[PDB]
Amino acid sequence: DPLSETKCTLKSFTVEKGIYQTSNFRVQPTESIVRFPNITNLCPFDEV
Amino acid sequence: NKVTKGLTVLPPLLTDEMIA
Amino acid sequence: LPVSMTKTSVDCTMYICGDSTECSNLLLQYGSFCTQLKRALTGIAVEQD
Amino acid sequence: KNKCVNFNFNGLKGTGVLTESNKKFLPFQQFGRDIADTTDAVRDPQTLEILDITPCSFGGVSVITPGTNTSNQVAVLYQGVNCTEV
Numbered sequence: 001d002p003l004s005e006t007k008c009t010l011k012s013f014t015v016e017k018g019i020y021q022t023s024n025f026r027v028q029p030t031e032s033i034v035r036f037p038n039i040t041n042l043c044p045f046d047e048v
Numbered sequence: 049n050k051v052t053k054g055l056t057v058l059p060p061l062l063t064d065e066m067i068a
Numbered sequence: 069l070p071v072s073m074t075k076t077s078v079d080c081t082m083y084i085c086g087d088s089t090e091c092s093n094l095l096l097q098y099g100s101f102c103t104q105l106k107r108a109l110t111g112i113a114v115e116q117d
Numbered sequence: 118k119n120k121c122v123n124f125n126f127n128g129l130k131g132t133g134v135l136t137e138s139n140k141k142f143l144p145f146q147q148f149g150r151d152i153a154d155t156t157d158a159v160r161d162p163q164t165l166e167i168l169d170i171t172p173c174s175f176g177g178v179s180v181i182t183p184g185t186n187t188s189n190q191v192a193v194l195y196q197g198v199n200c201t202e203v
């Protein structure tokens with residue numbers, strides 16, 4: 001929870017009154033996507 | 049009127065209205 | 069007479085490594101540079117206020 | 118799309134959320150760059166379209182709290198985020 005995040009960032013177990021900055025908003029990645037154009041103009045292996 | 053990523057600009061505590 | 073400038077803040081890990089997790093894992097062992105810079109910029113902001 | 122999905126477009130690798138884009142590339146244009154000189158728009162090699170690449174880690178966060186000697190209740194402030202996107 002944000003209190004625990006603040007404790008973790010400040011490296012202390014007690015936090016005094018005030019406003020603190022911890023981190024930003026983040027969505028962990030799930031998959032890796034790879035894209036290339038259409039695979040045309042195949043080499044002439046059949047004639048070989 | 050005469051005066052005109054990872055990095056953020058924080059607004060001031062006192063708005064121009066309170067200064068006025 | 070000028071009084072205060074624009075208060076700015078930095079996200080050290082996000083600026084340095086972006087969205088590469090392995091970059092952050094490699095970064096975490098250079099120490100507390102990010103903490104130092106965050107502390108300095110927060111000090112500047114509160115000084116402006 | 119619309120997720121933190123690593124992408125490797127024609128040998129160009131990156132990480133981010135893919136979204137539909139309104140920018141109009143010229144016919145030969147392939148990659149799009151922002152003020153930061155970093156890839157922000159891409160063109161799908163298979164289908165001729167334009168995709169914006171926003172970040173996965175966007176949204177500043179801070180924790181307002183009284184002294185833990187007093188109470189444990191906290192409040193969360195998301196910087197620069199409209200209240201309906203959390």
Ligand SMILES: *[C@@H]1O[C@H](CO)[C@@H](O)[C@H](O)[C@H]1NC(C)=O
Binds near residue numbers: 162163164
């Ligand atoms: C690639 O193939 C798909 C269908 O297989 C087609 O819709 C698309 O137009 C092709 N790309 C080009 C550049 O012709």
